[PDB]
Design a protein around this ligand. Structure first.
Ligand SMILES: [Zn+2]
Lengths: 128, 229, 217, 212, 95, 172
RNA sequence: UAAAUCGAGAG
DNA sequence: ATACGCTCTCTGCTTATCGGTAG
DNA sequence: CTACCGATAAGCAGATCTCTCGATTGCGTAT
């Protein structure tokens, strides 16, 4: 994860704002991401450079008993993409394996969002 | 925390779950459930009740060509000697079956005319590995030997524990099959209801004749036959 | 870390904190070479952390047992844990065998319902006699007093007793037999200094024992 | 290894002297800042084994303490050379306190005090007796970074405090009579300790805790 | 009849009694009740090494540092290759 | 239990799941996942299994993970080695996709668990019963349609598109 | 006019 | 047509029982 | 030898934001 995140950081450093076709302030995506109106730098990085490594509870994509991260990957494949590294971007779309990994990450995010609200009310009740 | 759980289904798509627990003492326990409560039996009892077996037959069926494996030999010796210690009288298949039938007669609502050997055979045929059905006592015995060997392999750290949450180990209750099985349970309840009606007739009334069509049609009208409701 | 930690502090006021820690400052006099070894002079060492393997040779017909313990090389555990042959052998003689015999007697009570050299010297025989006398049912004992890579001893039980696992017992005892430990402390670390100050982080809480080490802490 | 015991006893003696000095009795910094070799010469015989009968000493209130706390009397600090405390030692210690009429005597043992001996600690009012393990005094708690400065208030200042905030004695924050700092200062139930607390937002500010 | 630490009857196969729990010089089967002398069964020696995993530690870890060819019938017959070239899609098998 | 898993590829839809309390628990099927509803004719399979090299379990004298247990629908049929077990598993797949042999239904799920170091218990399993989850994949040899199940899928490699096929590692 | 339980939703 | 009996917890506290003291 | 002071192993209790809809509500004898 550290190495693939370093690669992601290199890509983002190289490809924005230098590689953008439209520049700030004309580029409204960057205009509203830099000014804080809405969004962040990671959002425009995912939109324009790559999604990057998908983290499932701090780890990479889960592995089956056979050692395959997915049916389309050979067992114990030493690939960043096999482990959940999405090189695609939301501008050009993502491959079905990357789509599956991103779905895993989004589902985990929704589960955490649902479980976080229920985990904090009792503390405030007891304190109050 | 080890174990081997199996969910067998009869041809009519109803399920019985058999759980083999491993006890740190060294004995393995067969676990099932009949109406709404759980029951436990040393699995050597069921192994000898299923078919005519020696004690070395179980040893060969569990321990294969790996005679020189200390773990399996010690565990199986513990199991067999525990069964010998706890039940020194049980020596042949029919005696074990009679003991089992005596133990499980009240719960199973067994009829007074049922011999203990035959009610033990019935308890076997209704509980242990139903998916083999009747006449599959040899197949049930082989399956139990395989499951015991799998449990011992798990407790020895030679197998990963299967994940019930993974869809690799799951199936779908279609709803129509659930409809069929709940209807079957209601029909069973209907038969029990008519028998309970004629039982309350035995202890109260006197105009009772099993060979009379009039009595049959009279007592059938006394139960709630509205299964559809 | 996070809300559960708050749950420990505010909601429960747990004296039994799930993961206790302790921070120790470092005198500028001491060096990191000494620091890395001081954290190994406090961190606990179970007897199991040095045993390479255990071989139980059971021959029944009184029951016999040859509880051979094969250790890692002396240069290995004498460096990784700073544990020498004498300390390990004393722990085995005093602590390990007592716990093993207690567990065996308890189990029986609840169930009633390359070749090592044979020749020995003068002192080893007397040590074997003392170990036999102090314990209940040991008839042989020996330790590799020259290399410290094995320990073979006998264990006799009544011929009436049925079969015991005698490997799970040893596994349980070895993980609970202790070479060296400061009470309530299981490990000491030397993390990277944060905000400048050099700190030792320990996974237990015992102030009284850290009060002794004025030299380092 | 006996050197380790000597050093531990030296540290315990230093911390006991610091505790006595903090309690308000006259102890000069010469006694507190005692070098280890000087301690060995003054308290270890030819064999080098320290004797704890000569370590026992007496202290008297300072001029300022008598001005502020008129009720204070002499203090007797005892070390037990015996590896344990029995009925014989405790009762003899109590009688030694009585016959010299000491207002307070603090007991320092080595391993433990027998429960039959523990019965004689509250035996004789008003002269209280306090018990301290040697191993619990190897490091002075009040020298720790987190502990603040505790100063026991006199009766007049307690009146002024309970008059300024219009309080009962009980409405104050409480400090346990058995927590280490209260044993250090020698707090008897009823009197207040002022606490000079260094804050992250306000620097020095004064709190007050009554012992109950 | 002797395997591991247990002895099985040569007639029926029921597990025999522990020899050291019976009167000397005669073992009797539990079910068929045959005659077994305690001789020739001198040593029930079984060795048991630990799991080689029961002791996790730090020093422990330091001693451990397009075409498809398919076999259809049995090990004797040669592998059969199924090609499906992407140039034209023509698929065929080869032995 | 709410986690999305790689085993559900092609059976449970990764996207279709409510947000909130039922997240992960209430999910939906992939649009091509047909659930079995009738028992396949598995009467003739034991006969052709014996011809392949399976040793019948009635007179085998074998047990353990060191040999491959060949079972059908929860009934031990034989004991053949892991290598020959893999050979006969691939043979059964090839014969079942090539719909010539009458004894092999197209819906026969062939779950082969090869030997592995402390992995899943090895052996050859054949399922043909009710309520199984089945999805259509494309068997690359014969370029035909095969039906696979969750148990059968976690060990074979199915390329997500023909442009990503690799030699000797993909069969579907 | 009420109450549970189940089910479905919204933020 | 009709009335009255019913199978995968976190934090403690609280209880029962086991050793040691000293009486 | 016997009675008091603890010292764990086992058992037991309560507990872990608002809002909008719809649908059901029991049987089993006895007279
Ligand atoms: Zn016999």
């Amino acid at each position: 994860s550290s190495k693939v995140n370093a690669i992601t950081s290199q890509v983002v450093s190289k490809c924005v704002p230098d590689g953008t076709m439209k520049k700030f302030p004309c580029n409204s995506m960057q205009a509203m991401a830099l000014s804080g109106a809405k969004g962040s730098n990671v959002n425009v990085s995912q939109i324009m450079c790559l999604l990057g490594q998908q983290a499932l509870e701090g780890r990479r994509v889960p592995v089956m008993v056979s050692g395959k991260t997915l049916p389309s990957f050979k067992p114990y494949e030493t690939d960043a993409m096999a482990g959940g590294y999405v090189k695609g971007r939301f501008y050009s779309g993502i491959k079905p394996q990357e789509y599956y990994f991103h779905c895993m990450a989004g589902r985990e995010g929704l589960i955490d969002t649902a479980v976080k609200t229920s985990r904090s009310g009792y503390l405030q009740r007891c304190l109050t | 925390h080890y174990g081997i759980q199996i969910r067998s289904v009869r041809p009519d798509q109803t399920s019985q779950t058999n759980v083999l627990h491993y006890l740190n003492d060294g004995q393995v326990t067969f676990r099932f459930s009949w109406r709404k409560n759980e029951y436990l039996v040393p699995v050597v009892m069921i192994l000898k009740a299923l078919c005519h077996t020696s004690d070395r037959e179980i040893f060969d069926g569990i321990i294969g060509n790996d005679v020189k494996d200390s773990f399996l030999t010690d565990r199986l010796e513990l199991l067999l000697r525990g069964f010998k210690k706890r039940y020194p009288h049980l020596q042949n298949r029919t005696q074990v079956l009679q003991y089992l039938g005596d133990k499980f007669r009240v719960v199973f609502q067994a009829s007074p005319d049922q011999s203990d050997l035959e009610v033990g055979q019935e308890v076997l045929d209704r509980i242990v590995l139903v998916h083999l059905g009747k006449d599959g006592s040899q197949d049930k015995f082989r399956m139990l030997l395989f499951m015991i060997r799998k449990l011992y392999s798990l407790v020895a750290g030679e197998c990963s524990p299967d994940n019930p949450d993974a869809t690799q180990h799951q199936e779908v209750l279609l709803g129509g099959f659930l409809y069929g099985m709940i209807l079957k349970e209601k029909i069973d309840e209907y038969l029990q209801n008519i028998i309970a009606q004629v039982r309350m007739d035995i202890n109260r009334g006197m105009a009772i004749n099993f060979k009379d069509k009039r009595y049959m049609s009279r007592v059938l009208m006394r139960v709630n036959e509205n299964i559809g409701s | 870390l996070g809300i559960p930690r708050l749950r420990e502090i505010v909601m429960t006021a747990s004296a039994a904190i799930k993961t206790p820690q302790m921070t120790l400052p470092i005198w500028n006099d001491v060096s990191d070479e000494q620091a890395d070894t001081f954290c190994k002079s406090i961190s606990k060492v179970l007897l199991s952390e040095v045993i390479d393997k255990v071989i139980v040779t059971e021959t029944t017909g009184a029951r016999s047992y040859v509880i051979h313990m094969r250790f890692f090389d002396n240069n290995e555990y004498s460096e990784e844990y700073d544990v020498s042959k004498e300390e390990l052998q004393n722990v085995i003689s005093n602590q390990f065998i007592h716990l093993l015999e207690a567990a065996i007697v308890k189990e029986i009570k609840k169930q009633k319902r390359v070749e090592a050299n044979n020749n020995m010297n003068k002192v080893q025989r007397d040590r074997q006699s003392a170990i036999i006398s102090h314990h209940r049912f040991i008839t042989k004992y020996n330790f590799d007093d020259e290399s410290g890579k094995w320990c073979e001893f006998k264990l006799e039980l009544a011929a009436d007793t049925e079969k015991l696992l005698m490997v799970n017992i040893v596994e349980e005892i070895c993980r609970k037999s202790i070479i060296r430990q400061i009470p309530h402390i299981d490990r000491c670390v030397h993390p990277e200094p944060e905000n400048g100050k050099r700190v030792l982080v320990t996974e237990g809480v015992n102030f009284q024992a850290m009060w002794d080490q004025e030299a380092f802490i | 290894e006996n050197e380790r015991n000597i050093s531990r006893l030296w540290r315990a003696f230093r911390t006991v002297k610091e505790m006595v000095k903090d309690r308000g009795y006259f102890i000069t910094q010469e006694e507190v800042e005692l070098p280890l070799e000087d301690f060995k010469a003054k308290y270890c015989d030819s064999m080098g084994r320290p004797q704890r009968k000569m370590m026992s000493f007496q202290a008297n209130p300072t001029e300022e303490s008598i001005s502020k706390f008129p009720d204070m009397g002499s203090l007797w600090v005892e070390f037990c050379d015996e590896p344990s405390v029995g009925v014989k030692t405790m009762k003899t210690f109590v009688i030694h306190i009585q016959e010299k009429n000491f207002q307070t005597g603090i007991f320092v043992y080595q391993n433990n005090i027998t429960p039959s001996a523990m019965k004689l600690v509250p035996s004789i009012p008003p002269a209280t007796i306090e018990t301290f393990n040697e191993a619990a005094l190897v490091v002075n708690i009040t020298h720790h970074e987190l502990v603040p400065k505790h100063i026991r208030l006199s009766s007049d200042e307690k009146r002024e405090l309970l008059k300024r905030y219009r309080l009962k004695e009980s409405q104050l924050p409480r400090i346990q009579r058995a927590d280490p700092v209260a044993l250090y200062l020698g707090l008897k139930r009823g009197e207040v300790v002022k606490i000079i607390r260094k804050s992250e937002t306000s620097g020095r500010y004064a709190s007050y805790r009554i012992c109950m | 009849s002797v395997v591991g630490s247990l002895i099985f009857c040569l007639d029926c196969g029921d597990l025999l009694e522990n020899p050291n729990a019976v009167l000397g010089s005669n073992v009797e089967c539990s079910q068929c009740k045959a005659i077994y002398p305690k001789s020739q069964f001198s040593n029930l020696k079984v060795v048991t090494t630990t799991a080689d995993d029961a002791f996790p530690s730090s020093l422990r870890a330091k001693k451990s540092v397009n075409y498809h060819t398919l076999q259809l019938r049995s090990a004797d017959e040669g592998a059969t290759v199924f090609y499906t070239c992407t140039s034209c899609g023509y698929k065929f098998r080869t032995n | 239990v709410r986690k999305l898993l790689p085993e559900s590829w092609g059976f449970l839809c990764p996207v279709h799941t409510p947000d909130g309390s039922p997240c992960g628990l209430l999910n939906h099927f992939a649009h091509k996942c047909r659930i079995s509803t009738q028992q396949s004719d598995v009467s003739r399979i034991p006969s052709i299994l014996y011809s392949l090299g399976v040793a019948p379990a009635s007179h085998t004298f074998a047990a353990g993970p060191s040999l491959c247990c060949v079972q059908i629908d929860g009934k031990i049929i034989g004991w053949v080695s892991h290598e020959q077990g893999k050979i006969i598993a691939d043979t059964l797949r090839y014969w079942k996709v090539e719909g010539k042999t009458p004894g092999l239904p197209i819906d026969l799920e062939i779950g082969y668990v090869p030997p592995s170091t402390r992995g899943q218990y090895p052996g050859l399993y054949l399922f043909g019963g009710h309520s199984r989850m089945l999805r259509p994949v494309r068997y690359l040899p014969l370029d035909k349609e095969d039906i696979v199940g969750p148990f059968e899928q976690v060990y074979m490699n199915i390329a997500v598109t023909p442009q990503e096929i690799q030699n000797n590692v993909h069969t579907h």
